[PDB]
Ligand code: HEM
Ligand code: HEM
Ligand SMILES: NCc1ccc(C(=O)N2CCC3(CC2)N=C(N)c2c(F)cccc2N3)cc1
Ligand SMILES: NCc1ccc(C(=O)N2CCC3(CC2)N=C(N)c2c(F)cccc2N3)cc1
Ligand SMILES: C[C@H](O)[C@H](O)[C@H]1CNc2nc(N)[nH]c(=O)c2N1
């Protein structure tokens with residue numbers, strides 16, 4: 001009937017019933033796998049079978065009208081009929097603006113790996129389903145970036161491009177994120193910039209983009225429209241807001257010459273809703289300090305500044321047991337938060353975020369008897385057990401609507417020219 | 418054929434084949450659940466069915482002889498025959514000392530939640546399968562504690578009590594750990610000592626144990642022998658080695674009056690091997706600093722000293738974004754490591770431990786194509802992504818031999834007197 005969940009920090013118990021509405025993934029528990037097939041929705045070469053589409057469409061429409069505080073029975077029935085007829089006569093159907101808005105928010109609510117879901121009801125939706133060219137995609141994206149950045153007062157938004165038709169005319173953003181720094185393999189063998197974007201940077205260069213060989217060069221947008229070859233578009237520098245890193249006490253921190261972008265936006269995910277699939281739907285929220293201070297700046301395969309910060313603090317960087325790494329990573333986190341705050345750019349520390357999600361989870365179980373959550377992604381990369389999420393048992397399941405991963409476009413794309 | 422595993426810090430790929438030898442657990446991924454049924458092996462009221470026992474026995478014997486560098490075919494066949502005959506004539510069978518040693522080490526190797534498995538081959542085995550009374554259990558346990566403590570130079574050991582026969586004569590240690598501090602609900606409503614042991618402490622008191630109402634009172638051993646009612650035995654103070662907490666710089670840290678025991682030993686788990694079950698098999702290794710500094714001292718449901726340490730450091734304890742918690746927990750971790758080191762008591766910091774396990778995992782895949790690992794338990798409660806384990810994809814599966822959890826004895830015990 002329900003799965004029992006326990007919070008070992010408060011002793012509180014919760015009953016999960018929502019998992020029954022899961023779509024089942026089948027299968028050596030693969031919890032720590034980053035990109036499993038169960039969270040990936042691949043490409044197609046033919047339209048969605050009507051026997052599959054119609055049932056999902058009905059299901060979604062029922063969910064939509066079932067969300068209203070005061071039911072609108074006639075509208076419900078009418079919409080059910082209109083959708084069916086549209087599917088029979090066209091082979092698919094178009095969501096109303098309100099349905100799309102509901103779908104985007106529900107898919108956000110259903111994102112197990114997002115710790116900021118308490119904000120789920122606050123989301124700006126940009127309808128670009130009429131987009132037809134790469135140039136138009138670029139314009140829509142620039143508008144998204146501008147609205148979201150909002151001069152430092154970050155706002156959550158999502159831009160919905162045309163849904164997948166037959167699978168050969170997909171709208172896709174080849175970039176993993178809207179804003180990301182380039183990575184270069186220098187002549188002397190050293191790596192410059194973000195080491196994690198070496199391959200994608202080389203791809204942009206291969207497509208005509210001009211490499212600037214800097215530490216923080218913003219990558220261009222590689223846009224695919226109507227299934228045609230991807231076109232490169234440089235992001236107008238005036239639209240990219242950045243924060244220069246400074247430490248409240250360590251004046252030498254500035255000497256590191258570090259900075260980061262204010263806008264965190266995923267650009268390569270697919271929105272699934274009522275049998276439909278939107279291969280291009282970039283969305284954004286705001287940053288959590290640890291993402292930059294810990295992952296971007298301290299991962300060894302990224303900027304890897306940990307040791308350098310250690311020496312500058314005068315720590316015993318040659319003795320692991322000294323816990324110098326713990327001390328350093330924290331000052332870096334302090335720098336990130338301090339800089340964003342000083343420059344009036346929205347950001348949240350991991351402690352506040354963790355308590356925020358706990359409140360949300362509590363609200364979700366009360367509202368719909370559950371909240372899909374991936375513990376591995378919800379617990380911060382530092383001070384894990386200091387946050388309440390660490391002590392909270394969670395159930396991870398895939399509902400609908402949902403935001404899926406996709407197979408890298410360059411691996412499945414059929415080149416024309 | 419094999420599952421692909423990737424380390425995102427080195428890019429290294431691994432092929433897991435060992436998971437095929439898993440015993441299958443069936444089923445809303447329940448990865449973050451602490452005590453799931455799949456990791457629990459409950460009580461019985463009748464002997465193990467021969468149709469089930471024999472196949473497992475054969476399987477184990479084959480594994481044992483199959484581990485030798487230079488095969489001993491005749492011995493193998495002979496043992497297979499002897500076991501079968503013993504099972505038919507007695508209804509069960511006895512493992513040889515060497516088989517038990519192999520079983521205990523293999524079960525350790527198969528513990529997905531243990532980060533210290535690189536030491537798997539270094540284990541002292543105490544054969545107490547001839548034990549018959551609670552008094553004898555107490556003596557065996559005191560010997561274990563003495564050998565393991567070794568005046569600060571901690572040694573890994575396990576004491577194997579008589580295997581389960583019919584299920585009504587089980588040898589069980591009611592304590593979760595060999596050494597643990599009491600928790601008291603004081604008259605003024607405040608909690609004194611380890612808040613997590615309130616219930617078990619009350620149980621000891623109900624069994625005649627005399628409460629000392631201290632902050633660090635070592636709990637007595639509650640021993641069950643031959644299925645009879647549990648008897649209480651106080652642990653001789655001379656056998657309990659403790660470390661007084663001091664900070665290398667903060668002279669005021671000592672004013673906190675903190676200390677902890679040097680011997681980390683689980684006492685309520687069950688060893689499963691070749692169809693047999695040993696409900697009582699206490700084992701120990703050595704401490705990892707974070708267990709004490711982070712979980713014992715900083716969990717809110719435990720000693721909860723975080724805020725107090727924060728104020729004493731003069732931090733902004735009323736502003737989460739200041740990251741005062743991160744700064745404090747680290748100094749506490751520094752104190753723990755410093756104190757254990759100064760007092761010459763074996764301990765490992767989480768960084769060294771993490772790199773140690775990574776080496777082990779590498780060895781395991783090379784040796785047998787796999788290593789069962791629970792990421793959620795292997796990543797430390799602080800500085801998660803700073804350790805390599807965080808970036809390592811892992812497969813969690815249950816093999817055999819294996820150390821299982823058990824249903825709390827006081828919930829299933831049938832009282833005599
Ligand atoms: C209100 C601000 C928001 C905050 C602070 C927030 C924060 C986060 C964080 C910290 C992560 C983990 C990132 C990583 O480790 O790669 C994440 C993941 C995610 N978020 Fe949220 N988020 C917000 C808004 C949104 C919005 C508006 C959507 C979608 C409509 C969303 C969808 C997701 C999804 C699908 C993931 C998983 C991405 C992946 O698998 O790489 N989030 N978010
Ligand atoms: C050589 C020293 C060893 C170290 C440093 C070590 C360390 C650890 C640590 C840190 C944990 C997690 C504890 C927790 O969070 O509750 C653990 C769990 C575990 N260890 Fe090891 N260990 C060692 C030896 C052993 C030995 C000798 C055995 C058994 C023969 C063993 C069996 C296990 C098992 C079964 C678990 C899971 C316990 C549970 O689920 O509560 N370990 N160990
Ligand atoms: N593995 C290397 C890597 C990955 C992602 C980013 C990146 O640009 N990020 C990190 C993930 C990201 C979006 C910004 N961070 C958020 N706060 C975010 C968000 F606010 C909403 C939805 C998804 C998000 N994910 C940088 C580097
Ligand atoms: N949840 C409250 C709690 C749990 C366990 C202990 C405890 O005594 N511990 C923590 C777990 C423990 C054994 C010592 N720590 C180890 N290093 C250990 C070990 F060395 C070998 C096997 C199992 C172990 N587990 C204290 C408090
Ligand atoms: C192997 C492991 O799944 C991987 O390193 C993880 C774990 N936890 C994470 N959690 C978040 N939020 N983001 C991540 O990228 C990861 N990566």
Ligand SMILES: C[C@H](O)[C@H](O)[C@H]1CNc2nc(N)[nH]c(=O)c2N1
Nearest residue numbers: 390391392393449450451793794
């Ligand atoms: C809910 C969650 O499983 C629980 O808090 C965990 C997680 N990680 C852990 N990891 C270890 N090593 N030990 C623990 O007790 C826990 N507890």
